[PDB]
Every structure is written in structure tokens, then in C-alpha cells.
PDB file of C-alpha atoms in Angstrom:
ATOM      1  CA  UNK A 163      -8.713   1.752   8.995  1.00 43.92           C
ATOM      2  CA  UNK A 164      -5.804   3.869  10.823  1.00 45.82           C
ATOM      3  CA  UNK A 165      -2.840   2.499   8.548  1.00 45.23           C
ATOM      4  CA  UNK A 166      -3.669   5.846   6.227  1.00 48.45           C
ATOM      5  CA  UNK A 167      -3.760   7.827   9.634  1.00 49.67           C
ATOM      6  CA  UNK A 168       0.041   7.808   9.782  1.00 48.75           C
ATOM      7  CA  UNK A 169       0.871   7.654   6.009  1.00 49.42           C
ATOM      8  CA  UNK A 170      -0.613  10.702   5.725  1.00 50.31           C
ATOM      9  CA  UNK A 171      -0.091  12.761   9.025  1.00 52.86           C
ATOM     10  CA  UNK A 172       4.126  12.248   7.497  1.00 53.36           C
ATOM     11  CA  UNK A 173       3.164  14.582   4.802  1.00 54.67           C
ATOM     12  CA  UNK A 174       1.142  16.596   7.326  1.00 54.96           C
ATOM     13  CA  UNK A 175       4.419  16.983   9.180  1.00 53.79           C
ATOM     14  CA  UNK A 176       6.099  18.116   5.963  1.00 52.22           C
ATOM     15  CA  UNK A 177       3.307  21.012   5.565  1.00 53.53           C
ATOM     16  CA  UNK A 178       4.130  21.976   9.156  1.00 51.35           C
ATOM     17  CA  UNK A 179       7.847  22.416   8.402  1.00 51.98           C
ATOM     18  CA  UNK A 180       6.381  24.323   5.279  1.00 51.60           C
ATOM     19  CA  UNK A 181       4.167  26.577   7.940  1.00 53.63           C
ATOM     20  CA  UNK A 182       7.432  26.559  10.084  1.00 51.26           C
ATOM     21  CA  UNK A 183       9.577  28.134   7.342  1.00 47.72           C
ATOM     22  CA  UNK A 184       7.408  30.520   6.340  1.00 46.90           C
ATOM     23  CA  UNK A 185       6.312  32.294   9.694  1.00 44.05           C
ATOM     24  CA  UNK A 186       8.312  30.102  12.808  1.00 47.84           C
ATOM     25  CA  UNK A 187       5.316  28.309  14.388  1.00 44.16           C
ATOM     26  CA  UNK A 188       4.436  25.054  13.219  1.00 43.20           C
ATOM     27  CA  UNK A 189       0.231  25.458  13.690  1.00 46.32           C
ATOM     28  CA  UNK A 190      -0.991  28.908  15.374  1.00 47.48           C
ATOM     29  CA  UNK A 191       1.183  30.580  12.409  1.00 47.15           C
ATOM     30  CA  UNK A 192      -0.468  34.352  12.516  1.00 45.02           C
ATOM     31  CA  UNK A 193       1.055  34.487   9.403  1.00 44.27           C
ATOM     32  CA  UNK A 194      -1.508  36.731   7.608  1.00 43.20           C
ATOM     33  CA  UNK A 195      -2.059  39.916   8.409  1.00 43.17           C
ATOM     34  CA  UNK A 196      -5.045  42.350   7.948  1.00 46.29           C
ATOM     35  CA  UNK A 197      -2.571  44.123   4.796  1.00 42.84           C
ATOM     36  CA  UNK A 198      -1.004  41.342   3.639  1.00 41.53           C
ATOM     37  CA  UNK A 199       1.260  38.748   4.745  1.00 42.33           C
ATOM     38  CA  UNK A 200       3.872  39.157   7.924  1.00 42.59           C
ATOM     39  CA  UNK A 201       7.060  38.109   5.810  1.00 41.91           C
ATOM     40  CA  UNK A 202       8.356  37.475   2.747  1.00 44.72           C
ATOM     41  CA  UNK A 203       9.245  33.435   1.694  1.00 47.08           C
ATOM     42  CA  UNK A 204      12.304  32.077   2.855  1.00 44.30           C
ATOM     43  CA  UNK A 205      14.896  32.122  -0.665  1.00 47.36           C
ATOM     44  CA  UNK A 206      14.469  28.678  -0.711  1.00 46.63           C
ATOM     45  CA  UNK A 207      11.044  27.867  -0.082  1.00 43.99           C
ATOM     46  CA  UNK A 208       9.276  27.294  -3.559  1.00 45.06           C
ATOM     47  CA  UNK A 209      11.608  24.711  -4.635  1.00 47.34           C
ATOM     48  CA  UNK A 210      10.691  22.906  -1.755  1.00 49.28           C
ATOM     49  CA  UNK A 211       6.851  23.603  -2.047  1.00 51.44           C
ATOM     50  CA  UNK A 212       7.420  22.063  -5.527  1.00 48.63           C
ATOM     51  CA  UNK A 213       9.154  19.249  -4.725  1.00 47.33           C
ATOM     52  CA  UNK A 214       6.742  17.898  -1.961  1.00 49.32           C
ATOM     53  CA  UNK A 215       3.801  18.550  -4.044  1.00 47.26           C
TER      54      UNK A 215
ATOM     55  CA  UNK B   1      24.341  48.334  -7.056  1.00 46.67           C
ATOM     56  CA  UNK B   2      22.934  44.719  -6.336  1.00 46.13           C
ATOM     57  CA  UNK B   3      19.614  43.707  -7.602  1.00 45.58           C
ATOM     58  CA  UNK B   4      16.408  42.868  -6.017  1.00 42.25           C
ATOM     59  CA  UNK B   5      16.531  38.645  -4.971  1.00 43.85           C
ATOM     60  CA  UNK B   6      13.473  37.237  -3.256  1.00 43.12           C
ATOM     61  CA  UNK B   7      11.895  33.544  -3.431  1.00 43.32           C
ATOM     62  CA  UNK B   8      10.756  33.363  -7.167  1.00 40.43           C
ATOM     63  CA  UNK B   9      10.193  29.990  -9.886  1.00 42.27           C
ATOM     64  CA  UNK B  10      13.284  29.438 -11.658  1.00 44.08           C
ATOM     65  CA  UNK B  11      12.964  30.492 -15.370  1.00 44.39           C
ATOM     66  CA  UNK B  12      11.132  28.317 -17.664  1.00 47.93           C
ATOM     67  CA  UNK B  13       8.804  28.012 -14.513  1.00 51.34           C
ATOM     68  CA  UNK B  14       8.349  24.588 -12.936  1.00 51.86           C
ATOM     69  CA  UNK B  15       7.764  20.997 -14.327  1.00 52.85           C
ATOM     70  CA  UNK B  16       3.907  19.792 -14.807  1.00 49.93           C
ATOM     71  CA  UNK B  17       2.559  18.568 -11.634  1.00 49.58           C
ATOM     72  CA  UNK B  18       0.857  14.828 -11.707  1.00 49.13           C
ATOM     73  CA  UNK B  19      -2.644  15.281  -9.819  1.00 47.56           C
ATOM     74  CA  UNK B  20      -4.929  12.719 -11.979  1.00 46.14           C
ATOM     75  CA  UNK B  21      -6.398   9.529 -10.193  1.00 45.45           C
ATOM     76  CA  UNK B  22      -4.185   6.918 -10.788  1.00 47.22           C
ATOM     77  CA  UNK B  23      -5.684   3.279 -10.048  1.00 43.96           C
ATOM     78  CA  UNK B  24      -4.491   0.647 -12.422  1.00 45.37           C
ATOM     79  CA  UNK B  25      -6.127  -2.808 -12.805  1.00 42.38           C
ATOM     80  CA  UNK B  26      -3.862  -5.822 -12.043  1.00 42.48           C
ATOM     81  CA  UNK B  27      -5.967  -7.690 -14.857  1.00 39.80           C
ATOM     82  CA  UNK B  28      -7.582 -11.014 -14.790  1.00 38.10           C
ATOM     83  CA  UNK B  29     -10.722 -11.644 -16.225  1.00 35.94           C
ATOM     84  CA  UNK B  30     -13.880 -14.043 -14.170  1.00 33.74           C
ATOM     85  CA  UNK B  31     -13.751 -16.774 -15.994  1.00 33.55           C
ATOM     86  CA  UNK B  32     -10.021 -17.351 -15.515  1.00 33.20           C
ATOM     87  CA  UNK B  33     -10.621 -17.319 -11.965  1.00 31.14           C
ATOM     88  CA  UNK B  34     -13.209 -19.780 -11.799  1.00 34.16           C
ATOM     89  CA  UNK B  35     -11.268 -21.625 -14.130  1.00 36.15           C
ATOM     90  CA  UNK B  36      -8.030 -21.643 -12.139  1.00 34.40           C
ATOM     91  CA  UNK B  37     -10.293 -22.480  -8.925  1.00 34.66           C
ATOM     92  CA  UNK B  38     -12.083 -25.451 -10.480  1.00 31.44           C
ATOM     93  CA  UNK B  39      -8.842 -27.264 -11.787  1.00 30.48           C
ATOM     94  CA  UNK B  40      -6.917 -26.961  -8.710  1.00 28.57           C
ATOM     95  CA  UNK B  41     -10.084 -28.441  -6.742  1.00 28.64           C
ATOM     96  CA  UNK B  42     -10.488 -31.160  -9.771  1.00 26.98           C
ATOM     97  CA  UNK B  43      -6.664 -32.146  -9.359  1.00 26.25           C
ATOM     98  CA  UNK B  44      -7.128 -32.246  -5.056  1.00 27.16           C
ATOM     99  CA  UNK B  45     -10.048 -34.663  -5.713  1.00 26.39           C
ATOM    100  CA  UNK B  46      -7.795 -37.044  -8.090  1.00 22.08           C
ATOM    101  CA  UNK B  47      -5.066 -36.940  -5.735  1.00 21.15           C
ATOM    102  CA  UNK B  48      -7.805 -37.464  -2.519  1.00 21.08           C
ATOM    103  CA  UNK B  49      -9.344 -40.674  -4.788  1.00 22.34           C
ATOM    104  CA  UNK B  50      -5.951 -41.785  -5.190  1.00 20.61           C
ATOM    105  CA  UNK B  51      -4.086 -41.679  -2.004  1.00 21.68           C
ATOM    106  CA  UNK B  52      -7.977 -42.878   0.097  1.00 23.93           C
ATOM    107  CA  UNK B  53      -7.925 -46.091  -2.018  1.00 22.05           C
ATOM    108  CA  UNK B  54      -4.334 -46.414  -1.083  1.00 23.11           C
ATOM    109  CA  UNK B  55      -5.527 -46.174   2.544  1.00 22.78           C
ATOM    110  CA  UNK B  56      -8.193 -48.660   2.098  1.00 22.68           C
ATOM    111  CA  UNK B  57      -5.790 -51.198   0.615  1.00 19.66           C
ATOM    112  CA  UNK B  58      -3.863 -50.505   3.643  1.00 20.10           C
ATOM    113  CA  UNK B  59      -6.512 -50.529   6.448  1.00 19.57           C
ATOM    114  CA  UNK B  60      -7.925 -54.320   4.336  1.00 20.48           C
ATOM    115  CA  UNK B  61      -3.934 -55.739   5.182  1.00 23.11           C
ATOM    116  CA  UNK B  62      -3.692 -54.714   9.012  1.00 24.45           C
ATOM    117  CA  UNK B  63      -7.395 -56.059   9.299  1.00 25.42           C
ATOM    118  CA  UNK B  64      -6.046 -59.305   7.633  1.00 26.14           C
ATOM    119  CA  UNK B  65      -2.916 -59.162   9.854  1.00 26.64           C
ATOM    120  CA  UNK B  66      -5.278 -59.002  13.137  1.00 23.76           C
ATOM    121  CA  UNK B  67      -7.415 -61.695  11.806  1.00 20.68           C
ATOM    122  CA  UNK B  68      -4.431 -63.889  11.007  1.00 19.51           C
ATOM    123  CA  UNK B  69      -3.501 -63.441  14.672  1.00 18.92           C
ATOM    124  CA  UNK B  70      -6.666 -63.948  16.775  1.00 18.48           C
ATOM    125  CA  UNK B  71      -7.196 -67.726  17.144  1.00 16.65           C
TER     126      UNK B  71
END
């Protein structure tokens, strides 16, 4: 098919900026830890969560 | 002093979220179809009868030309 491939892997690439945000690395995030989570959100993060989704 | 200020929804929370299958039908039925596909054939064969008869005519006054000419 491989039209859907790239229509798709865009909002991928939005995700990744979402992963980005929220701990610095795109993919290999290490975001959550054994007690919780590393960080807390970025202040503007949510809205943004909400307006992709 | 200042108060505590950290990612939350804004008040009111956030608008309803579309996530239902969404595949409308463009909308024609069979029959209208086969209809459309039969008329536009019927009206290619009238026009073909038409314009090969034409042809025939045609082909019938050359030939008569050529005969005219061969003695």
C-alpha cells in the first residue's frame, strides 16, 4: 500500500516531539522510573496532547 | 507566597474527543449504475449507426469516382 506509511509516520513524528518534551530523547526515553516517573510535564504539554489527539 | 503551578486541564476540563468510525457512503444505488452505463452505451451505438452509414455513403462515391475513371 505504502501511501498510509507516511501519512501516518507524520503523526508518529508528532508523538516523538510529545516523547521529546516530556523526557529529551525522542525514542530510548527512560522516562519511567522504578518509583514513578523521572519529571514532571512540561507547563504546556496537555494542551498540546489534546490538541493532536 | 506563590502557589503551586504544574501542567494541569484547564477548568471545565477539555472538549469531547471524536474517536467513532467515521465512513460515509457517497450514495448511489445499482440500478442507477447500470442504468447510467446502458444509456451511454445505447447513445454510442446510435451515434456509431449513424456516422458508419455516413461512411458507407462515402466509401459507395470514391468507388464510383474510381470506376468513372478506369476506362
Amino acid at each position: 500500500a505504502m501511501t498510509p506509511f507516511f501519512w501516518m509516520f507524520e503523526e508518529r513524528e508528532k508523538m516523538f516531539e510529545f516523547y521529546e518534551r516530556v523526557s529529551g530523547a525522542r525514542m530510548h526515553a527512560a522516562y519511567i522510573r522504578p518509583g514513578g516517573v523521572h519529571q514532571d510535564l512540561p507547563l504546556g504539554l496537555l494542551d498540546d496532547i489534546y490538541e493532536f489527539s | 507566597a506563590s502557589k503551586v503551578k504544574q501542567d494541569m486541564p484547564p477548568p471545565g476540563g477539555y472538549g469531547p474527543i471524536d474517536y467513532k468510525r467515521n465512513l460515509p457512503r457517497r450514495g448511489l444505488s445499482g440500478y442507477s449504475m447500470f442504468a447510467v452505463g446502458i444509456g451511454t452505451l445505447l447513445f454510442g451505438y446510435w451515434s456509431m449507426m449513424k456516422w458508419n452509414r455516413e461512411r458507407r455513403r462515402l466509401q459507395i462515391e470514391d468507388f464510383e469516382a474510381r470506376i468513372a475513371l478506369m476506362p
